[PDB]
Design an enzyme around this catalytic site. Structure first.
Site, PDB file in Angstrom:
ATOM      1  N   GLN B  11       0.888  -1.247   0.064  1.00 54.43           N
ATOM      2  CA  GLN B  11       0.089  -0.039  -0.149  1.00 54.43           C
ATOM      3  C   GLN B  11       0.933   1.344  -0.069  1.00 54.43           C
ATOM      4  O   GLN B  11       0.521   2.382  -0.365  1.00 54.43           O
ATOM      5  CB  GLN B  11      -1.071   0.107   1.257  1.00 54.43           C
ATOM      6  CG  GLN B  11      -0.390   0.023   2.474  1.00 54.43           C
ATOM      7  CD  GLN B  11       0.268  -0.958   2.939  1.00 54.43           C
ATOM      8  OE1 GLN B  11      -0.229  -2.138   2.861  1.00 54.43           O
ATOM      9  NE2 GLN B  11       1.431  -0.845   3.718  1.00 54.43           N
ATOM     10  N   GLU B  71      -4.605  -4.536   2.095  1.00 51.09           N
ATOM     11  CA  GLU B  71      -5.502  -3.890   2.887  1.00 51.09           C
ATOM     12  C   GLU B  71      -6.378  -2.836   2.214  1.00 51.09           C
ATOM     13  O   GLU B  71      -5.887  -2.085   1.251  1.00 51.09           O
ATOM     14  CB  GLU B  71      -4.915  -3.029   4.010  1.00 51.09           C
ATOM     15  CG  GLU B  71      -3.956  -3.827   4.825  1.00 51.09           C
ATOM     16  CD  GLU B  71      -2.639  -4.194   4.267  1.00 51.09           C
ATOM     17  OE1 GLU B  71      -2.449  -4.188   3.102  1.00 51.09           O
ATOM     18  OE2 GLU B  71      -1.769  -4.397   5.235  1.00 51.09           O
ATOM     19  N   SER B 140       8.807  -2.445  -1.913  1.00 51.35           N
ATOM     20  CA  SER B 140       9.646  -2.007  -0.669  1.00 51.35           C
ATOM     21  C   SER B 140      10.392  -3.182  -0.159  1.00 51.35           C
ATOM     22  O   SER B 140       9.502  -4.173   0.106  1.00 51.35           O
ATOM     23  CB  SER B 140       8.883  -1.035   0.114  1.00 51.35           C
ATOM     24  OG  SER B 140       7.764  -1.960   0.754  1.00 51.35           O
ATOM     25  N   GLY B 144       5.680  -4.376   4.595  1.00 49.14           N
ATOM     26  CA  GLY B 144       4.636  -5.172   5.149  1.00 49.14           C
ATOM     27  C   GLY B 144       4.010  -6.109   4.361  1.00 49.14           C
ATOM     28  O   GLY B 144       3.650  -7.028   4.486  1.00 49.14           O
ATOM     29  N   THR B 145       3.267  -5.443   3.222  1.00 46.97           N
ATOM     30  CA  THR B 145       2.962  -6.451   2.194  1.00 46.97           C
ATOM     31  C   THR B 145       3.833  -6.453   0.637  1.00 46.97           C
ATOM     32  O   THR B 145       3.509  -7.180  -0.009  1.00 46.97           O
ATOM     33  CB  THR B 145       1.267  -5.974   1.906  1.00 46.97           C
ATOM     34  OG1 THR B 145       1.353  -4.593   1.056  1.00 46.97           O
ATOM     35  CG2 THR B 145       0.568  -6.080   3.018  1.00 46.97           C
ATOM     36  N   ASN B 206      14.621   7.573   1.234  1.00 43.91           N
ATOM     37  CA  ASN B 206      14.004   9.026   1.535  1.00 43.91           C
ATOM     38  C   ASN B 206      14.745   9.987   2.276  1.00 43.91           C
ATOM     39  O   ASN B 206      14.431  11.216   1.954  1.00 43.91           O
ATOM     40  CB  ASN B 206      12.647   8.650   2.354  1.00 43.91           C
ATOM     41  CG  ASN B 206      12.832   7.773   3.312  1.00 43.91           C
ATOM     42  OD1 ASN B 206      13.869   7.026   3.459  1.00 43.91           O
ATOM     43  ND2 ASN B 206      12.186   7.906   4.603  1.00 43.91           N
ATOM     44  N   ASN B 228       6.776  11.743  -4.049  1.00 43.63           N
ATOM     45  CA  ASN B 228       6.104  10.835  -5.208  1.00 43.63           C
ATOM     46  C   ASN B 228       6.455  11.418  -6.662  1.00 43.63           C
ATOM     47  O   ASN B 228       6.518  10.985  -7.630  1.00 43.63           O
ATOM     48  CB  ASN B 228       4.738  10.529  -4.981  1.00 43.63           C
ATOM     49  CG  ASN B 228       4.450   9.815  -3.616  1.00 43.63           C
ATOM     50  OD1 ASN B 228       5.286   9.348  -2.978  1.00 43.63           O
ATOM     51  ND2 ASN B 228       3.079   9.983  -3.207  1.00 43.63           N
ATOM     52  N   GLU B 254      19.292  -2.691 -23.559  1.00 41.60           N
ATOM     53  CA  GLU B 254      20.832  -2.079 -23.596  1.00 41.60           C
ATOM     54  C   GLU B 254      21.148  -1.730 -22.066  1.00 41.60           C
ATOM     55  O   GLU B 254      22.423  -1.762 -21.835  1.00 41.60           O
ATOM     56  CB  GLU B 254      20.813  -0.916 -24.385  1.00 41.60           C
ATOM     57  CG  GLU B 254      20.916  -0.949 -25.884  1.00 41.60           C
ATOM     58  CD  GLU B 254      19.442  -1.661 -26.252  1.00 41.60           C
ATOM     59  OE1 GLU B 254      18.567  -1.616 -25.598  1.00 41.60           O
ATOM     60  OE2 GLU B 254      19.330  -2.097 -27.413  1.00 41.60           O
TER      61      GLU B 254
END
Ligand SMILES: Nc1nc2c(ncn2[C@@H]2O[C@H](COP(=O)(O)OP(=O)(O)OP(=O)(O)O)[C@@H](O)[C@H]2O)c(=O)[nH]1
Ligand SMILES: Nc1nc2c(ncn2[C@@H]2O[C@H](COP(=O)(O)OP(=O)(O)OP(=O)(O)O)[C@@H](O)[C@H]2O)c(=O)[nH]1
Lengths: 49, 438, 49, 427
Positions: B11, B71, B140, B144-145, B206, B228, B254
């Site tokens: 998510q 979720e 990621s 978590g998911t 980040n 983002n 390439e």
């Protein structure tokens, strides 16, 4: 937050170049720490139906 | 033809895909409804969107991406958004239960009954696709998911389809910031599972993205929308070659052949040079020289890696905008003459240049600059092993005291696989100095 | 006068196809310009053998 | 009559042939729509060397474009002269190259060699009698090296009695962009020296220096570079298409240029290159043409033959000249630097004079050279090949394709034999 940034396209009454040489931090600042709060937040069509 | 499929797992990995498509719909002028003005661009689905969207005779641009999540909170929220009419409902793959930050739970407990469903989506997307160079996976490491569910599917898409590329994009774990102490558990679990299957894994952190904001953008309080936007700009820059043309046109194939030197290690680093504020753009000038200095300036890397602590192997610069080969080839020649940049003696040449005529554009309600000349810096260096070196001494202690194992052994797992990753990891560092040693 | 002055000022009058949009000179001159020939348009008809 | 069919190969040659053919159309005066504006009888007579006839006075180019990526082909078709090129002449594939020498040499070419051979033989049956063929491509180009080497091999047994002209551009020595480029070049050149008889060597860096020298225009377009090479290749072809007491056959040229069969690589040379004010400051006279013709700065091909000596030199003059000035000018240069030639061959000059001036200038010339200036070239690539073959970088791909260090051993070994060869004949 999604509604504001994405759907509402952010705060209309704000002045665009509200960011320039300020006081304490004599630089570009007074842009956004307030953030929008106004306008109908919870008014999509599925609620009324 | 020249198309690809984008994947968005986790998510946290879906709002980034949301922004990119929002960013993508601007340059093509896509109205939120799904149709152009009375201008004639609709047909069987053959124009600049054919590589990104599927605007068939129905007239609605269908993005070639699938959003999967466990979720329903965020996915239903964006299902109530602005372009939800554009989005095909059941490729917004929603979930009813979470993986609870457990790799195995998303990899075993729930991933089985969902992968078959998304398998139907991809094949029914595969049949309509024509050339489909490869895949675009957004995920990621500390997922978590993102972690567990992606791991199973990438195994499944690898085994059935091994003749095409798979492009990987995940937020790298913050070296000193941890929102979860189980993040070292799943992250190294993901890496050891993916090393023998993943084609090109690209990472980002980040903190330095945050550090950039108040350095040159002078934003001390940005938001995800800005975050983002930056990564969406990055993927937009690399995908312009599919959208438009240039002096020479390059492709991921390439990129794969030239970037990864040797097997296993396929983890280069991206960078964007003209990261600057709007006002700084106004009363200044941009040219290839200074941005070439900026692109190779160590503090401009979003990954906390110090180049003088490592050595360079490859550098891919994708010049988007108005450039001439004259100053570009001269400027890079000066870079070759620079002493501080310590390329390995193995590669005399390590520069993959891509020229694109289309100027990088601004986004309404955005914060970027008015870029005439931009370049994306895909590079790989040996200064990255310290990150895994950081992870293991984090991991070696906690495993020695085997915290939280009762959760994973409670749901049916054991320590043998956990043992694998550590020498699997130890294999990764030991190779890194082996290639690091000349 | 900057570096490379004389011709740059003089070429714009002989090069009578200037684009109007900003930065589009490369887009306009992507095909190229007339450098490898005389400014005059036509030297055919020379039955000179 | 004796004709030539062209092959447009590699993605660079896609720009080259595009520029190469439009100049010819402009040179002969055909409109972009294809309706020839009848203006010169001699070009009206000798357009059949390269162009066939369609209905409505439309000279169809006898050239073949080959590629894999549609977008480049769409661009050239959307170019000013795409309409004059045939959709029949657009043969291609459904796959991406990866800039891979082997994939275009074993994987993707396999299902495309059949189609291209049928097209060219259909074109071959269309025409009457060929001098041979010429090819526009690059040695360092991913697909171009893979295709041509396959194609030149196949056409060798197909017609071993013709002219196999090759026109390949050498990538930049300082940076090759493509890191595996030396592998592609070494692989390609192995087949090239076996199959080719003539080779033009062209380098982008020198053209950049040329732009710094006489063009003086700072920022050119790569097509403008394509204009430069097209003008040179136009001049070497003006011999065949135009009258005048000059012997034009490439065989006539090749035997005068090739002392030993293994001499296939040749360097170009062009005539007056002019700057901003010097057009009206130039007294275009045979001495100053000859001086500028033999200028190391005027050279554009690989690297200065000052480092070595001169085996064979052949210059073609295009304009209203006479036999006497060209004769004394060679005597002048012969006396100027006599020892810089090799004692193996004296009077190694081969002159041809085209009496038909170009459209835009009268006095002009083209030069083809064979000097000891290529040693550094393959010596340069030798260290690069050895360094990357030292620890086998970027190798799993070609083994994954099915290649092996087997092939690389003799490829460099064949290359090394050339190193001592160019050394042995001169030194
Ligand atoms: N990719 C991405 N990561 C984010 C974003 N915002 C925060 N993060 C970080 O990324 C991590 C997301 O990982 P997970 O929490 O495991 O995501 P998940 O696997 O989909 O499952 P959840 O635990 O329900 O979120 C968070 O811990 C944050 O530190 C975002 O917008 N995109
Ligand atoms: N068309 C074109 N080619 C260029 C240009 N500049 C350099 N080149 C080089 O010319 C080479 C020859 O092109 P091709 O033989 O068609 O190459 P390919 O087999 O299609 O594969 P690549 O070499 O990866 O392009 C390329 O490898 C480029 O590196 C340019 O401005 N235009």
């Amino acid at each position: 937050t999604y509604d504001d940034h994405y759907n509402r396209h952010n705060y209309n009454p704000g002045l665009p170049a509200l960011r320039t040489w300020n006081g304490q931090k004599l630089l570009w600042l007074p842009e956004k720490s307030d953030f929008p709060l106004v306008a109908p937040p919870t008014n999509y069509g599925l609620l009324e139906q | 033809m020249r198309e690809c499929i984008s994947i968005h797992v986790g998510q946290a990995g879906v709002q980034i895909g949301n922004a990119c498509w929002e960013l993508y719909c601007l340059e093509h002028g896509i109205q939120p409804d799904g149709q152009m003005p009375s201008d004639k661009t609709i047909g069987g689905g053959d124009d600049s969107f054919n590589t990104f969207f599927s605007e068939t005779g129905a007239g609605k641009h269908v993005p070639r991406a699938v959003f999967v999540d466990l979720e329903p909170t965020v996915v239903d929220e964006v299902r109530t958004g602005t372009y939800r009419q554009l989005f095909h409902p059941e490729q917004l793959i929603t979930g009813k239960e979470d993986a609870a930050n457990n790799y195995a739970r998303g990899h075993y407990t729930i991933g089985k009954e969902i992968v078959d469903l998304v398998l139907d989506r991809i094949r029914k997307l595969a049949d309509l696709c024509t050339g489909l160079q490869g895949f675009l996976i957004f995920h990621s490491f500390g997922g978590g998911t993102g972690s567990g569910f992606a791991s199973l599917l990438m195994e499944r898409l690898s085994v059935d389809y091994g003749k095409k590329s798979k492009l990987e994009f995940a937020i790298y774990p913050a070296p000193q910031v941890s929102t979860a102490v189980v993040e070292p558990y799943n992250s190294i679990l993901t890496t050891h599972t993916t090393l023998e299957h993943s084609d090109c894994a690209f990472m980002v952190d980040n903190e330095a993205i945050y550090d950039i904001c108040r350095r040159n953008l002078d934003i001390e309080r940005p938001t995800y929308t800005n975050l983002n936007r930056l990564i969406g700009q990055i993927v937009s820059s690399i995908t312009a070659s599919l959208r438009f043309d240039g002096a020479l046109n390059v492709d991921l194939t390439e990129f794969q052949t030239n970037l990864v030197p040797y097997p296993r290690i396929h983890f280069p680093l991206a960078t964007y040079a003209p990261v600057i504020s709007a006002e700084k753009a106004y009363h200044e000038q941009l040219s290839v020289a200074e941005i070439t200095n900026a692109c190779f300036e160590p503090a401009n890397q979003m990954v906390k890696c110090d180049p003088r602590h490592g050595k360079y192997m490859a550098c891919c610069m994708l010049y988007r905008g108005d450039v001439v080969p004259k100053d570009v080839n001269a400027a890079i020649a000066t870079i070759k003459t620079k002493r501080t940049i310590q390329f390995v003696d193995w590669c005399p040449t390590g520069f993959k240049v891509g020229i694109n005529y289309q100027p990088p554009t601004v986004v309404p309600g955005g914060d970027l600059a008015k870029v005439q000349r931009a370049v994306c810096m895909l590079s790989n260096t040996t200064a990255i092993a310290e990150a895994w070196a950081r992870l293991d001494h984090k991991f070696d202690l906690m495993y020695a005291k085997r915290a939280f194992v009762h959760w994973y052994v409670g749901e049916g797992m054991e320590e043998g696989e956990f043992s694998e990753a550590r020498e699997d990891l130890a294999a990764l560092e030991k190779d890194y100095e082996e290639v690091g040693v000349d | 006068l900057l570096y490379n002055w004389e011709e740059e000022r003089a070429t714009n009058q002989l090069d009578q196809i200037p684009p109007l949009q900003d930065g589009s000179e490369s887009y306009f001159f992507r095909h190229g310009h007339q450098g490898l020939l005389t400014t005059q348009p036509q030297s055919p008809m020379s039955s000179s053998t | 009559m004796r004709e030539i069919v062209h092959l447009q190969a590699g993605q660079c040659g896609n720009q080259i042939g595009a520029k190469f053919w439009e100049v010819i159309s402009d040179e002969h005066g055909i409109d972009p729509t294809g309706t020839y504006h009848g203006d010169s009888d001699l070009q009206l007579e000798r357009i059949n060397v390269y162009y066939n006839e369609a209905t409505g006075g439309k000279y169809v180019p006898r050239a073949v474009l080959v590629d894999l990526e549609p977008g480049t082909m769409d661009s050239v078709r959307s170019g000013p002269f795409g309409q004059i090129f045939r959709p029949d002449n657009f043969v291609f594939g459904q796959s991406g190259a990866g800039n891979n020498w082997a994939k275009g040499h074993y994987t993707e070419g396999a299902e495309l060699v059949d189609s291209v051979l049928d097209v060219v033989r259909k074109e071959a049956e269309s025409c009457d009698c060929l001098q041979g063929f010429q090819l526009t491509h690059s040695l360092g180009g991913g697909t171009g090296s893979g295709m041509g080497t396959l194609l030149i091999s196949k056409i060798r047994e197909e017609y071993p009695d013709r002219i196999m002209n090759t026109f390949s551009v050498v990538p930049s020595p300082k940076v090759s962009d493509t890191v595996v480029e030396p592998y592609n070049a070494t692989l390609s050149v192995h087949q090239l020296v076996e199959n080719t008889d003539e080779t033009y060597c062209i380098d982008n860096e020198a053209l950049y220096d040329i732009c710094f020298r006489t063009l003086k225009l700072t920022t050119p377009t790569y097509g403008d570079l394509n204009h430069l090479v097209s003008a040179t290749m136009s001049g070497v072809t003006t011999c065949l298409r135009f009258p005048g007491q000059l012997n034009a056959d490439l065989r006539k040229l090749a035997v005068n240029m090739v002392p030993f069969p293994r001499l296939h690589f040749f360097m170009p040379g062009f005539a007056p290159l002019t700057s901003r004010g010097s057009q009206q400051y130039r007294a275009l006279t045979v001495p100053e043409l000859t001086q500028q013709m033999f200028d190391a700065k005027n050279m554009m091909a690989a690297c200065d033959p000052r480092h070595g000596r001169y085996l064979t030199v052949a210059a073609v003059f295009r304009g209203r000249m006479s036999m006497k000035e060209v004769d004394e000018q060679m005597l002048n240069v012969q006396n100027k630097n006599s020892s810089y030639f090799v004692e193996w061959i004296p009077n190694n000059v081969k002159t041809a004079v085209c009496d038909i001036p170009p459209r835009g200038l009268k006095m002009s010339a083209t030069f083809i050279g064979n000097s000891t200036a290529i040693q550094e070239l393959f010596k340069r690539i030798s260290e690069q090949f050895t360094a990357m073959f030292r620890r086998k970088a970027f190798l799993h791909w070609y083994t994954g394709e099915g290649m092996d260090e087997m092939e690389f051993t003799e490829a460099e070994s064949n290359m090394n034999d050339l190193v001592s060869e160019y050394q042995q004949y001169q030194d």
